[PDB]
């Protein structure tokens, strides 16, 4: 009953955003709640933010 | 009747038919987004009765 | 009767490191200026970075040219960390041609008059054939912050070609800014500090120029409180 088929492949690159779900190995799930700017994050004496 | 893969779709704006080639199928490399047309097709339909 | 901090000598540890000092800082002001500046430098410094590459025979980022040993999605991740200076213009269009076995570095970009590539050994890709070849037309712009490629898709203005690969742009010359307020001893005073802003850039922004460009962002923003207009 078919005549011709056409298959198309889109390659979308999904970045990260609030609502996503991350997790370490030891069973500590989580959901991202914010993306702070670089300068709000805490920094040690050297200035390197976490 | 048999459906077709016409590159000319009834009453669709020219902006939507920008990436479809003359054969009807989208080019390989185009950046499509929500709502765009990837493969033009028209199904016959008579007996209007408006 | 406050004192005025005056810019003093600028130790330069490397091409990318630096340290400044603001000698006669009054008591309690070492931390008021110290952190007021560090939130200005990490946020709003103008720099230039790549904005869209266009290679000769490749259509999309998920392709693979024959002759190099990296995807076209992996050459774009090496270009995104290309440190470059543009003297007078706003946007430039660099060029890179090369053939023959061996790595392709930033030193092989067609040397324009203004565009001054700063890290000339930055590897881009390797050519693993005697009769291979790459030809790309990079583009450079000026801006601040970080603007992804998705945002610029709204300001494409009928981006006619389909061979125009877009890279995300992060125009910011600074990567970390520490500071330390220690004791300064003027010839006769009891309370005085000395700020030491140890900034580390990617060789693009000048240190002395990078701190005056901050105070004119802060003193220009405090124009609103000097006169409250209701």
From Swiss-Prot, chain A:
Recorded superkingdom: Bacteria
UniProt biotechnology annotation: Co-administration of salinamide and rifampicin or salinamide and myxopyronin suppresses the emergence of resistance to both antibiotics.
PTM comment text: Acetylated on several lysine residues in the presence of glucose.
Main function: DNA-dependent RNA polymerase (RNAP) catalyzes the transcription of DNA into RNA using the four ribonucleoside triphosphates as substrates.
Complex formation: The RNAP catalytic core consists of 2 alpha, 1 beta, 1 beta' and 1 omega subunit. When a sigma factor is associated with the core the holoenzyme is formed, which can initiate transcription. The rRNA transcription and antitermination complex (rrnTAC) consists of RNAP, NusA, NusB, NusE (rpsJ), NusG, SubB, ribosomal protein S4, DNA and precursor rRNA; S4 is more flexible than other subunits. In pull-down experiments interacts with CedA. (Microbial infection) Interacts (via flap domain) with Escherichia phage lambda antitermination protein Q; this interaction renders bacterial RNAP resistant to transcription pausing and allows it to read through termination signals.
Family the UniProt entry places it in: Belongs to the RNA polymerase beta chain family.
Protein known as: DNA-directed RNA polymerase subunit beta
Name of the gene: rpoB
Residues of the full protein shown: 1045 to 1094 of 1342
